[PDB]
Structure 1
Amino acid sequence: MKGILGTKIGMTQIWKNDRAIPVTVVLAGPCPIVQRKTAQTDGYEAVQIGYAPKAERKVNKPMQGHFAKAGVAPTRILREFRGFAPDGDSVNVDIFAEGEKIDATGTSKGKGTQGVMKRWNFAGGPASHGSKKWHRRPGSIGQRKTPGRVYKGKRMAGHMGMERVTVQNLEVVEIRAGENLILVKGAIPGANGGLVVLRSAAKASA
């Protein structure tokens, strides 16, 4: 339910009661409530919300009308959060607390076309004892006549990364409320400068 958007600033070192704890720093900047969607009108419950500011020369006339309907200086990015039904606008401060677990979703740093050794952890071949495919290469791909084909869902070289990724149950080390910063234990997916969505834990872990 609870969520907000932000940028991935970086990862540093920090002590808490004398134990080093790596943290990713996220700017969870103020998020305007643009469109507000009820089941009664739009068939499901959610709220639209925006992030990076964008100068209005750069804005489509239709997008200007969309932001103008609510009264919001136009933002570069928009997202929806199901079940989240706030009031006013969405600051980092009010909706997170020190020590909530929270899911952290982002877009994996993307690594291009990768071989099966990187993309899927294949063994690859011996590098000696005479053998071209001296590594890197997938081996066999089928059985023979009476399977007849190669399997759907098979694993082979492809575009690795650049994917949506959630990370469950990251811990909230510190909230510096006024600056719109938030420290979070461990490693959020993505790259510095990238979009990230911080949200409640999806699992109610007991």
Structure 2
Amino acid sequence: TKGILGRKIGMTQVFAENGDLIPVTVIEAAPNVVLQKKTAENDGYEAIQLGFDDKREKLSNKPEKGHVAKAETAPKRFVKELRGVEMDAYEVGQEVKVEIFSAGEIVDVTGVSKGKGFQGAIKRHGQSRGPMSHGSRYHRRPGSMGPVDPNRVFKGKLLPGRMGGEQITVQNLEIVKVDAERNLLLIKGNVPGAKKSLITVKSAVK
């Protein structure tokens, strides 16, 4: 189950070998460096930590410096592991590139969403509001709590609070273009997150 992790640059529009158009997200993915290989003999599972981007020496403290310096290219900004892979081809200190993907496969794309702040019932849960008129003073408001008899409101009544800022995976996204020397993936569709945010990319579980 191949996978890399990069950042969201933005959106383009790519003609695909015909008059037809493809909405494309452009993902810059620099070569990811393997930092450490979690094996079940001492960890109980099978995973591998991929690191991405390069921090400065003022930004990076000594625990990150040592943990990279087991097999060292440079201290890394985004460190995130992934599971369910073969382990003999992956080695510590090995670089994985976007060339391991091709322009035909089917991708799960995972990112942390945009933030919408404290924003309430109608915007948050997609529910309806009452009339603007005929004298009704009830609009933009959550609802009724529920029945009288339990003498409380039930658990999980959906209310105002904070939207966004959560990790969400879109499924079955399709690679359109892979660019080797400019380190790009170009994916059909739209991926969660604001610009320059971290998004990881996996071969989809079909």
Matched, 1:168 2:171: yes
Task: Provide the identity percentage.
Answer: 51
Counterpart position of 2:65: 64
Counterpart position of 1:137: 141
Runs of 4+ that moved beyond 4 A: none
Deviation at 1:147, TM superposition (A): 2.2
CA RMSD, aligned part only? Answer: 1.1
Deviation at 1:72, TM superposition (A): 2.5
**Mapping of residues 90-169 of structure 1, within 5 Å:** 90-94=96-100, 96-133=101-138, 135-144=139-148, 146-169=149-172
Look up the equivalent residue of 1:104 and give its one-letter code.
V
CA distance in 2, matches of 1:150, 1:90: 52
CA distance in 2, matches of 1:122, 1:108: 21
CA distance in 2, matches of 1:103, 1:136: 36
**Mapping of residues 187-206 of structure 1, within 5 Å:** 187-202=190-205, 204=206
CA distance in 1, matches of 2:145, 2:102: 51
Partner SS state of residue 58, structure 2: helix
Partner SS state of residue 63, structure 2: helix
CA distance in 2, matches of 1:26, 1:77: 15
Look up the equivalent residue of 1:159 and give its one-letter code.
R
Deviation at 1:121, TM superposition (A): 1.1
Look up the equivalent residue of 2:133 and give its one-letter code.
S
Number of residue pairs matched by the alignment: 200
CA distance in 2, matches of 1:7, 1:29: 9
CA distance in 2, matches of 1:63, 1:51: 13
Counterpart position of 1:83: 84
TM-score by length of 2: 0.93
Partner SS state of residue 22, structure 1: strand
Deviation at 1:116, TM superposition (A): 1.0
CA distance in 1, matches of 2:146, 2:152: 7
**Mapping of residues 6-85 of structure 1, within 5 Å:** 6-16=6-16, 17-84=18-85, 85=87
| Greater helix content | 1
CA distance in 2, matches of 1:121, 1:83: 36
Contact 1:34–1:72 at 8 Å: present in 2 too? no
Look up the equivalent residue of 1:29 and give its one-letter code.
A
Gaps of 5+ in 1: none
CA distance in 2, matches of 1:175, 1:168: 19
Superposed CA offset, 1:157-188 (max 9, x none): 11111110000000000101221101000100
Contact 1:29–1:180 at 8 Å: present in 2 too? yes
| Greater strand content | 2
CA distance in 2, matches of 1:196, 1:143: 43
Deviation at 1:83, TM superposition (A): 2.0
Look up the equivalent residue of 2:6 and give its one-letter code.
G
Look up the equivalent residue of 2:95 and give its one-letter code.
D
Superposed CA offset, 1:81-135 (max 9, x none): 01233232211112x11110100000110101111111001111100011222x2
